[PDB]
Curated annotation (Swiss-Prot), chain C:
The chain holds residues 238 to 443 of 449 of the full protein. It comes from Homo sapiens (Human). Residues 3-102, 111-206 form the Ig-like domain. It comes from the Eukaryota. Immunoglobulins, also known as antibodies, are membrane-bound or secreted glycoproteins produced by B lymphocytes. In the recognition phase of humoral immunity, the membrane-bound immunoglobulins serve as receptors which, upon binding of a specific antigen, trigger the clonal expansion and differentiation of B lymphocytes into immunoglobulins-secreting plasma cells. Secreted immunoglobulins mediate the effector phase of humoral immunity, which results in the elimination of bound antigens. Glycans are attached at N62. Changing N199A: Impaired ability to activate the classical complement pathway. Coiled coil: none annotated. It is found in: Secreted; Cell membrane. This is Immunoglobulin gamma-1 heavy chain.
Length: 211, 211, 212
């Protein structure tokens, strides 16, 4: 059990928004250095793929050369129903195993996005927390970001999507900003990129929601 | 090689208060059936103790011995952060693989609980969701539950503790209630339990006239 | 010179919290002053205990002595209704007496917690008093503590439980704070620790912005 191959899904943001190329990464881990003959094969829908980028093997803390194989995949190919399997052939590895991963879930569901203002107990703190509730989406592949005046706010942490009683998923996005910024009247928009939304994008703005 | 040990920490609800008895899970299951003799010596936090509650041997359909060797945990023991090593062994497993769990991590921090009224967009739907933001706690062991008029409200889901930018953790509790029930004079309270709180318990009441 | 056991019940906070839970005391009074032996035996529903501690006899100035005995008691046992009999034997009183204490039987009722602000006539004083009306609980075993901003408050006094008209009990907890802290918008809350409460705990916040 030397080569332990792990296949990871593409980036949930880049798989529907065009800023970076989404990519299935199939990188073996804890691989011995005595067998540098590794063949990487992709057989999505039975068709071999030969334009993938082959990162050179990198030395780790142990005596393992980390060979990295990355495949550039179009957004619309992963968005529809297409199964991606990674086949790795090694001399020490007995028989290559196809790691079947895909986005072919049951049925896409449009998330409902709600921006919640900070509690009045939080207003005494120096930094207030801005909450964006994104609920209702069935595929866990989602991207929730924050922005203010058209520029991103990187001081946010988003919970992983968890499954509720409806069978869909929900998460939360907490944005930490200064109390002066919130009390000055500045607006903040929670940007959500789910494949079931219109144009794969929605945005809800909160600056003062009282009533 | 052979026998395997998967240690489960006690639930925070069980180990934090009196409502449940904190029972650690020192399962020594999947012992290889070739040798029935195992070596057991309960070395709790490095010192052998007389307490040794071992289940009788159970033979599974996978030709592996299963024993649920659980133990009751004193509420003062986990506060001190002492270890709970069982030090299991076998002839086919000469090295003990007891991956001991201790709660003594870092410095505990008090959670800052904030309850959030639903946004105006949620009032259209018949399912109104209430939000409890629990932030600032460093140990991930925390239990959050909702209340209404002193009775439990089990139609809630909680995100896992997400690590924050200050080294502490945070999570959210989402309680879905009826729109008419929320718009009536019904109050709701989210109560959290954490080892750094006063009396290991705090709560915030969410009313229709809060935000 | 007749040793009668003064049974001390466990602390109501220790009954359902995890702070000092197994503390149960069986201190005897008016013990004999000419017998150097003390025979103790706790009978948890007639079963002998195995982990108990008895203090050596201390000098009492009223021609007597005082003995302290403490047994670790499980939290779920007392709560449910188990009976403990720390039987005390001596030479002056030959046949030992089996005295028991437990939680009071009957249907437990949950307490209704109410926070009342300081009155208008108390705003002239420099120290206002905050009251916590806890009414409707049938077992008298209850712990009421005040807190603010997650930190405990110690300048509080709680009345003993008073039997109500319907058979339940009620009490008040008076927390005396400075008028500056009350008018600053600081939030205070009385925590009620009762058996019939859900999660054995209930808080009720009291703040300046509590009226209209």
């Amino acid at each position: 059990g030397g080569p332990s191959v792990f296949l990871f899904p593409p980036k949930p943001k880049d798989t529907l928004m065009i800023s970076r190329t989404p990519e299935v990464t199939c990188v073996v881990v804890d691989v011995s250095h005595e067998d540098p003959e590794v063949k990487f094969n992709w057989y999505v829908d039975g068709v071999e793929v030969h334009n993938a980028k082959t990162k050179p093997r990198e030395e780790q803390y142990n005596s393992t050369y980390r060979v990295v194989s990355v495949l550039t995949v179009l957004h619309q190919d992963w968005l529809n129903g297409k199964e991606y399997k990674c086949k790795v052939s090694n001399k020490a590895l007995p028989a290559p195993i196809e790691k079947t991963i895909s986005k072919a879930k049951g049925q896409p569901r449009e998330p409902q996005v709600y921006t919640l203002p900070p509690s009045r107990d939080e207003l005494t703190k120096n930094q207030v927390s801005l909450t964006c509730l994104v609920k209702g989406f069935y595929p866990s592949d989602i991207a929730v970001e924050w922005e203010s005046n058209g520029q991103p706010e990187n001081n946010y942490k988003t919970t992983p999507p968890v499954l509720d009683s409806d069978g869909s998923f929900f998460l939360y996005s907490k944005l930490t900003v200064d109390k002066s910024r919130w009390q000055q009247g500045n607006v903040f928009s929670c940007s959500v990129m789910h494949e079931a939304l219109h144009n794969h994008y929605t945005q809800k703005s909160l600056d003062k929601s009282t009533g």
